[PDB]
Amino acid sequence: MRAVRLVEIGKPLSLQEIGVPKPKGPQVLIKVEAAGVCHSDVHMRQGRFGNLRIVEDLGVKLPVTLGHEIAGKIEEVGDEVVGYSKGDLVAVNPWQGEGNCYYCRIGEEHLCDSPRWLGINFDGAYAEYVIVPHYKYMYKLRRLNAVEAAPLTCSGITTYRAVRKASLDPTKTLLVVGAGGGLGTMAVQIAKAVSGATIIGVDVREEAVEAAKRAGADYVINASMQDPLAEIRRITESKGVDAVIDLNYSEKTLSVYPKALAKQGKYVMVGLFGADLHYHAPLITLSEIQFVGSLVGNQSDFLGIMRLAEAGKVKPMITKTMKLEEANEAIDNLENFKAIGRQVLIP
Amino acid sequence: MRAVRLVEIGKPLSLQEIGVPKPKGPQVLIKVEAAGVCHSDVHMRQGRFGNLRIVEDLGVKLPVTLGHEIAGKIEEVGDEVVGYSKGDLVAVNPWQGEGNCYYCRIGEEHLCDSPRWLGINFDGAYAEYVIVPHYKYMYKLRRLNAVEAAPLTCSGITTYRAVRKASLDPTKTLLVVGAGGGLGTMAVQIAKAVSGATIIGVDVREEAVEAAKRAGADYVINASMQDPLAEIRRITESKGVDAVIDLNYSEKTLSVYPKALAKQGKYVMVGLFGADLHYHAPLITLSEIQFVGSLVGNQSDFLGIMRLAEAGKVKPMITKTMKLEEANEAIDNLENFKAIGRQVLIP
Amino acid sequence: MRAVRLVEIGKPLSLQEIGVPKPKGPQVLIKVEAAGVCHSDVHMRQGRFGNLRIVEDLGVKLPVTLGHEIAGKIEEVGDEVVGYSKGDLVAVNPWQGEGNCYYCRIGEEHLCDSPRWLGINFDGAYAEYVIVPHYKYMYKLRRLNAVEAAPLTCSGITTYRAVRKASLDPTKTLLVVGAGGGLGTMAVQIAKAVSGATIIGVDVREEAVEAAKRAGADYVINASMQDPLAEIRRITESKGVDAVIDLNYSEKTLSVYPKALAKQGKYVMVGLFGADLHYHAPLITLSEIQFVGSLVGNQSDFLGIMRLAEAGKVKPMITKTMKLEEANEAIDNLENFKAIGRQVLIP
Amino acid sequence: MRAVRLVEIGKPLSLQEIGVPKPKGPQVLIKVEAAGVCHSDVHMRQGRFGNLRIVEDLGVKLPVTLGHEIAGKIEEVGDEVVGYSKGDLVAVNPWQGEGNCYYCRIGEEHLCDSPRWLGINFDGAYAEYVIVPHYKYMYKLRRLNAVEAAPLTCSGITTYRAVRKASLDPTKTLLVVGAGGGLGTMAVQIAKAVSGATIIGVDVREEAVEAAKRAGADYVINASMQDPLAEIRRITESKGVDAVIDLNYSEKTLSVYPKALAKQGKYVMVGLFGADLHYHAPLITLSEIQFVGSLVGNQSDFLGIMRLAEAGKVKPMITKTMKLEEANEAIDNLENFKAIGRQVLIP
Ligand SMILES: [Zn+2]
Ligand SMILES: [Zn+2]
Ligand SMILES: [Zn+2]
Ligand SMILES: [Zn+2]
Ligand SMILES: [Zn+2]
Ligand SMILES: [Zn+2]
Ligand SMILES: [Zn+2]
Ligand SMILES: [Zn+2]
Structure with missing residues (x-):
């Protein structure tokens, strides 16, 4: 053969x-x-x-x-x-x-x-x-x-496991980063099918933002046009989100999106990009946030x-x-x- | 009054x-x-x-x-x-x-x-x-x-909440950092009273090491006289530990003890010390480790x-x-x- | 007033x-x-x-x-x-x-x-x-x-709590008893909105079965036409269902539907009707089923x-x-x- | 051979x-x-x-x-x-x-x-x-x-699994039925080694009551000599126990001990004896009790x-x-x- x-x-x-x-x-x-x-x-x-x-x-x-x-x-x-x-x-x-x-x-x-x-x-x-x-x-x-x-x-x-690790329920909101890509739209679809959580998708191109909406996101954010952290705060009425799934994270995403986390928020990182997580330890304990990996x-x-x-x-x-x-x-x-x-x- | x-x-x-x-x-x-x-x-x-x-x-x-x-x-x-x-x-x-x-x-x-x-x-x-x-x-x-x-x-x-966040059971092993101090011995006692997990205590002075063992640790390590990672590696037969409770963490502990984590291991951080968490992201995804804060x-x-x-x-x-x-x-x-x-x- | x-x-x-x-x-x-x-x-x-x-x-x-x-x-x-x-x-x-x-x-x-x-x-x-x-x-x-x-x-x-007690996930199937009634349709809707589980609704009249279908059931069973336990077996490929939600249970539902449970299945009972739960203990232990009350x-x-x-x-x-x-x-x-x-x- | x-x-x-x-x-x-x-x-x-x-x-x-x-x-x-x-x-x-x-x-x-x-x-x-x-x-x-x-x-x-099923923690009390027999002393020891819960052991002859105590039970009761339900309510101050592990249940044990359950109590049944579980359903829903089998x-x-x-x-x-x-x-x-x-x- x-x-x-x-x-x-x-x-x-x-x-x-x-x-x-x-x-x-x-x-x-x-x-x-x-x-x-x-x-x-x-x-x-x-x-x-x-x-x-x-x-x-x-x-x-x-x-x-x-x-x-x-x-x-x-x-x-x-x-x-x-x-x-x-x-x-x-x-x-x-x-x-x-x-x-x-x-x-x-x-x-x-x-x-x-x-x-x-x-x-x-x-x-x-x-x-x-x-x-x-x-x-x-x-x-x-x-x-x-x-x-x-x-x-x-x-x-x-993505199925990443959604499970985000520990979602109907009282929570999820942020999917890079939500219009292949992995992102799949994560949005799965979160929509399995959780009851409000789903927010963020991406950087109009086409990708549209794909996130088409995949089922309740809210979408174009981070190249609007300050994404401010729009997340507006949508969640200042609470932040209870989980972020960052598929194919980068040095940029890891430096921005953890700030969108609500207290007890879980930041689920997926992928293998050569980047480092840098975070002020006191911010972690004060808010009880969690950084969790999945593959x-x-x-x-x-x-x-x-x-x-x-x-x-x-x-x-x-x-x-x-x-x-x-x-x-x-x-x-x-x-x-x-x-x-x-x-x-x-x- | x-x-x-x-x-x-x-x-x-x-x-x-x-x-x-x-x-x-x-x-x-x-x-x-x-x-x-x-x-x-x-x-x-x-x-x-x-x-x-x-x-x-x-x-x-x-x-x-x-x-x-x-x-x-x-x-x-x-x-x-x-x-x-x-x-x-x-x-x-x-x-x-x-x-x-x-x-x-x-x-x-x-x-x-x-x-x-x-x-x-x-x-x-x-x-x-x-x-x-x-x-x-x-x-x-x-x-x-x-x-x-x-x-x-x-x-x-x-410390009670930190032990709960460690998600311990009998199939697991816990490392308590600073295991011989005020918080450390309480953590050791609680873990011994509530989980059935194997408890390893690490500290830096012979007197603190004895206090950890007296608090109930199964294994104690003196990081001033031994390489804690080598000792942990053998105690766990190279698996690493399923949780680390780092009470009153510092730039030093955060730089050392995460390396002791088994896959799926939880690094529970407690306290407000002015230190930053620095960790290579692919290490987190590949091993499904979690850094979790608690206060x-x-x-x-x-x-x-x-x-x-x-x-x-x-x-x-x-x-x-x-x-x-x-x-x-x-x-x-x-x-x-x-x-x-x-x-x-x-x- | x-x-x-x-x-x-x-x-x-x-x-x-x-x-x-x-x-x-x-x-x-x-x-x-x-x-x-x-x-x-x-x-x-x-x-x-x-x-x-x-x-x-x-x-x-x-x-x-x-x-x-x-x-x-x-x-x-x-x-x-x-x-x-x-x-x-x-x-x-x-x-x-x-x-x-x-x-x-x-x-x-x-x-x-x-x-x-x-x-x-x-x-x-x-x-x-x-x-x-x-x-x-x-x-x-x-x-x-x-x-x-x-x-x-x-x-x-x-009903929301009943669904939570059913411990559903995408790998599972739920049976809602009386799925076309007010509580039954609400349970179907909630389970569909919050879980990813496959949903079977059963009821006893054509109109009720329709209501369950509209509520979102993946499969429906008219128990007045087909033997419901046989149909549940067919749908679940003989596994049975991982949960039953029986809102306003009766002597009739309690005597029939627990038999539909898969191993580890949870029978979530809600209501105050004067009926007794009656079940052969060995069947409970052999299958690890659970009867769980909710109010x-x-x-x-x-x-x-x-x-x-x-x-x-x-x-x-x-x-x-x-x-x-x-x-x-x-x-x-x-x-x-x-x-x-x-x-x-x-x- | x-x-x-x-x-x-x-x-x-x-x-x-x-x-x-x-x-x-x-x-x-x-x-x-x-x-x-x-x-x-x-x-x-x-x-x-x-x-x-x-x-x-x-x-x-x-x-x-x-x-x-x-x-x-x-x-x-x-x-x-x-x-x-x-x-x-x-x-x-x-x-x-x-x-x-x-x-x-x-x-x-x-x-x-x-x-x-x-x-x-x-x-x-x-x-x-x-x-x-x-x-x-x-x-x-x-x-x-x-x-x-x-x-x-x-x-x-x-018994290890039965104890896990009892869902214990330090705020809870466990009743082990048949606490002084081989299975019972093992269950008591395990609960003592892994849960933090207060443990009540009940059995039906003094030598067995003594063995339960030696295995770690905080309280022991000879159901042969004393009304076990009155004693349990005294110990738990009328709350009842949060779990019962009934090892080799019989028609007798099942007709008695469920009455000792607190709200949300879990009744864990172990064994294969020919006995039926008989229990008033409203008691189950009102108190959110659970009957759960384990093998x-x-x-x-x-x-x-x-x-x-x-x-x-x-x-x-x-x-x-x-x-x-x-x-x-x-x-x-x-x-x-x-x-x-x-x-x-x-x-
Ligand atoms: Zn408040
Ligand atoms: Zn691939
Ligand atoms: Zn203080
Ligand atoms: Zn293997
Ligand atoms: Zn098999
Ligand atoms: Zn009402
Ligand atoms: Zn045997
Ligand atoms: Zn109250």
């Missing part, structure tokens, strides 16, 4: 012709119908994941097939597989744990001590087929097609976003389909921030 | 002879049998509270009587007081809310938008009598005397620490009793870090 | 001409614009409340003006009232506590040991004016008029329902307006189950 | 000579050094487990080796086992899941839809060797030996109890060692309630 792989850091991905693994035991062989490409793969093609080394830290033994956003049809099931048959359309949770460590035992497998992340330190979906280590990481699609689902396994689970999500988060998306309660990302051969191209566009829409590789 | 009051910023407290207020409605006049003095009174005699101005921010109309650590016998009760009688020995929760704002409605009264903090922006216990705005803020002492209880209304409630506590936290103490499950702070007149003196020793043990004024 | 009061048990309410109280301190005098009437008032005109005696248990000193569903305009404010002004239209939370008991301290005021329930053991809104003990129990109306808001102070808060709610619950309603996120109850003098008739209609919609008296 | 097995329902267990399975993949073959025996095995020797049929319900293809309380040294590890070596002394969590169902995904593996319960529907520890389906279900013993640890896999995890526990509960025990924070159950050959004998003893102390078979 054809597979686009990381054979050497720095160097572009390489198309190879490798053997189609044979599924044994709980394993499932999936014929890939969609392989999402995201910013992570930009930093992945450079041998890193945030600031770790896939080789030194995650134990990657190059070459490795990339692609951690996976949906497709079951081609074959191992002999121990239960509850799935050839022909089933599924999405796959790639953030897999080994089972024995503390995080696996308490059901937070994505924080596993020795992670098995598909497409990061194990072969992924940039190929005609992909082995899923255990059938329990799958979700049968009934309403969504593969292209619609694949991005949910990464951006969907990430990807666990099996319950996967269940949650998949259930929302399958019920149509949240919508698929704006998508651009491309062929496998275009993998490097797709990633280049993400480097030059020339990727308008989630790129998904299709057969 | 006699009353030591902050009549002018900078200038030392003044011993005045003002009248004894008359208790009306749900108010309660307490004859002070113990007024604690703590570090906050040092930064108080300087017209501030962390970085605010009791006058401009907390609306303090000087002169204002200090003393937010209160315990005494009821002298007289308003006509709407129920369940308390003249003579009753009580401790008082000074962190009072007005009831109408968001924070009062959800039961977080200490975070009230228009706080009524006894001894901070309302007349405190640095006097012979003190008015408690509402009887519900009192707790009937049965086992403890005024001197032992008075510190609990500040240090006890503060004083609500009516539930007061009930909790008083119940523990009355049942002897947590012991009174080490105290040195003095006279009302020695107020300015008491606050001096705190300024010059010459005060060993909680100073308690006895009118 | 005119006031319809319970001057004797059994005997029908009595229209009296009493004096308009004077508001002092934190008290607020409201000019009633809407006094909701509900089933509770049936069991109230009979000196009871579930199984208690308002006189013996709640300390009711007859005569007492009924009316616990209250909205109107501020006529006058006590001298200590802050944040409200004459002419403000407000809804009132009647489930008030005294503040000192355990439940009040932990923020569960409706479960107070010495409750101050307006319209129950204190003068309520079946009159031209009503005294609210403390202004903090009010909520300013902007979107809603008094008639729309009054029922929310009872059915709204009750009315606290300040946070009131905040939540008013915020949803004021934002239009949940709709007001179908209402029939009547005159104060018709109070007895209104209650009669509830006894003869000839009441269509929530009856609201307008003085 | 020697293996006592349930070859036919009704008929007593049969000592057989079966081969020692070979551990493949993630499996681990353990050399049993302790096989606890508890009441469940009595109810098991009768093909049942509460009321089910291990064959019909749990898919038990007889003969099946009993023994769900497992501890011993690792004889051999599969080729996929990490973190454990031949020679390691371990305790085993028998309440295992398959991974794919909702309950496994959310980390509640004991509630798995297709449970793999060692000693119940999978071969247990009544043998010289036993296969563990996956190494993650193990815990390395450091301070405990096999005999001390094996019972924890059942009574320890069960065994999940991976996090197992981690918690093993941590407590390995730290000496709770003590091993009183045990009586016997030989594999006496399996039927031990179960007989439990049938005739002639068994004093947890019987542990040592092949």
Whole structure:
């Protein structure tokens, strides 16, 4: 089968012709119908994941097939597989744990001590087929097609968990920063579907502000036009917001938005940008605010976003389909921030 | 009555002879049998509270009587007081809310938008009598005397809430920083009394290390003689700790102890020291750590620490009793870090 | 002023001409614009409340003006009232506590040991004016008029708390029993506005099933046509539901719907009907199900329902307006189950 | 190897000579050094487990080796086992899941839809060797030996979870019913080690009342000699208890102790006795009480109890060692309630 792989850091991905693994035991062989490409793969093609080394830290033994956003049809099931048959359309949770460590035992497998992340330190979906280590990481699609689902396994689970960490309820207000981008609109949609909280989206372009409104925000702010802190204060009648979700935070967002926090406000940071949080400690204790990080999500988060998306309660990302051969191209566009829409590789 | 009051910023407290207020409605006049003095009174005699101005921010109309650590016998009760009688020995929760704002409605009264903090922006216990705005803020002492209880209304409630925010259970490990000082040993005792978590105490002098161990720590570390991070790494088998309670944090502690956090770990900061939190953002997202602030506590936290103490499950702070007149003196020793043990004024 | 009061048990309410109280301190005098009437008032005109005696248990000193569903305009404010002004239209939370008991301290005021329930053991809104003990129990109306808001102070808060007790999230499914009734549709609307859970509504007539569908149920079951437990199994792929909300339970609902629960499922029961819960203990332990009671709610619950309603996120109850003098008739209609919609008296 | 097995329902267990399975993949073959025996095995020797049929319900293809309380040294590890070596002394969590169902995904593996319960529907520890389906279900013993640890896999995890379900804190009071039996003293110790709550222990013979007191109960009551309800109301000053943990409830306990519940009290039921819960529904709603079932526990509960025990924070159950050959004998003893102390078979 054809597979686009990381054979050497720095160097572009390489198309190879490798053997189609044979599924044994709980394993499932999936014929890939969609392989999402995201910013992570930009930093992945450079041998890193945030600031770790896939080789030194995650134990990657190059070459490795990339692609951690996976949906497709079951081609074959191992002999121990239960509850799935050839022909089933599924999405796959790639953030897999080994089972024995503390995080696996308490059901937070994505924080596993020795992670098995598909497409990061194990072969992924940039190929005609992909082995899923255990059938329990799958979700049968009934309403969504593969292209619609694949991005949910990464951006969907990430934003779903970030919304959960914002601890929202009907008495609260949420601020979503960068609310008109891919991640932002998804966070707005999920917060709207799952919380009852008032949702405020802030962005910096008229088009992105409109996308935030279309995604369901109750209020939107164009920070290039209005002082955002003053508009947040006006909307919340000087209370501030009870949570901020800052997806792909930057040095700028971290310096501005914590000031919009109400007492006990939670500032949820998502992403891997090389920026530092700088905050006056007394301001933290006096207001009991919290700064909390989030990345990807666990099996319950996967269940949650998949259930929302399958019920149509949240919508698929704006998508651009491309062929496998275009993998490097797709990633280049993400480097030059020339990727308008989630790129998904299709057969 | 006699009353030591902050009549002018900078200038030392003044011993005045003002009248004894008359208790009306749900108010309660307490004859002070113990007024604690703590570090906050040092930064108080300087017209501030962390970085605010009791006058401009907390609306303090000087002169204002200090003393937010209160315990005494009821002298007289308003006509709407129920369940308390003249003579009753009580401790008082000074962190009072007005009831109408968001924070009062959800039961977080200490975070009230228009706080009524006894001894901070309302007349405190640095006097012979003190008015408690509402009887519900009192707790009937049965086992403890005024001197032992008075510190609990500040240090006890503060550390009780900090332990709750650590979100501890038996599967977890807590690090208490400064574990051998006044606040540190209380935190250790409370954590040992209420969570079942493994408790590590760290301090910098052999004497403080012994006090932490005597307060119940499972493991104690002397950071002057050992590398706390290496010790913690082995105690937790490289996982790190699930919470750090940093009472009276500094630029130094904030720069060291966050590195001890396990994934999902909570760094609970308590106090008003002029230090800034500096932390690389990707470290926060990758490990899902949380920096959480905490100060004083609500009516539930007061009930909790008083119940523990009355049942002897947590012991009174080490105290040195003095006279009302020695107020300015008491606050001096705190300024010059010459005060060993909680100073308690006895009118 | 005119006031319809319970001057004797059994005997029908009595229209009296009493004096308009004077508001002092934190008290607020409201000019009633809407006094909701509900089933509770049936069991109230009979000196009871579930199984208690308002006189013996709640300390009711007859005569007492009924009316616990209250909205109107501020006529006058006590001298200590802050944040409200004459002419403000407000809804009132009647489930008030005294503040000192355990439940009040932990923020569960409706479960107070010495409750101050307006319209129950204190003068309520079946009159031209009503005294609210403390202004903090009010909520300013902007979107809603008094008639729309009054029922929310009872059915709204009750149902909102029931939904919170069901512990819903996007990975779960809820069953609302009697989903087409006034309380049932409110529960469906709230669950849809606040949770992300999949919602199944069940009722027993075609028109009721339609009402549940309009309220927002994802699935509906006509139990007069299909076996409801089998249909719930089909919908949930044999898992059962993670919660049941059974508002105004009967002997019939309690004998059938707990069987629909998934493992760990919560059966939230609301109401005072004289029925017994009857269930085989081993089934409870084997499935870890929970039976949980709920009645009315606290300040946070009131905040939540008013915020949803004021934002239009949940709709007001179908209402029939009547005159104060018709109070007895209104209650009669509830006894003869000839009441269509929530009856609201307008003085 | 020697293996006592349930070859036919009704008929007593049969000592057989079966081969020692070979551990493949993630499996681990353990050399049993302790096989606890508890009441469940009595109810098991009768093909049942509460009321089910291990064959019909749990898919038990007889003969099946009993023994769900497992501890011993690792004889051999599969080729996929990490973190454990031949020679390691371990305790085993028998309440295992398959991974794919909702309950496994959310980390509640004991509630798995297709449970793999060692000693119940999978071969247990009544043998010289036993296969563990996956190494993650193990815990390395450091301070405990096999005999001390094996019972924890059942009574320890069960009571640990019951205590968590009681939702305790320092402001609360817990009643443990059957407080002086093996399960009861474990529950008391755990509540004392992990909750801060005041503990009332009730039992029905003086020797058991004394054992409850030695286990940590603050108050103890002999329900044989004194009205337990009057005594509880005296101790709690009429508030009632905030939780009851009813270990091996009976028709008697369930008809009595719910009456001792405070408002919001949680009644935690543990066990499989043939009794019905009968309770007036209005009492449930008026007081917001909860009846909640609890059975065994999940991976996090197992981690918690093993941590407590390995730290000496709770003590091993009183045990009586016997030989594999006496399996039927031990179960007989439990049938005739002639068994004093947890019987542990040592092949
Ligand atoms: Zn991705
Ligand atoms: Zn792991
Ligand atoms: Zn203090
Ligand atoms: Zn307030
Ligand atoms: Zn009502
Ligand atoms: Zn109360
Ligand atoms: Zn057992
Ligand atoms: Zn399962």
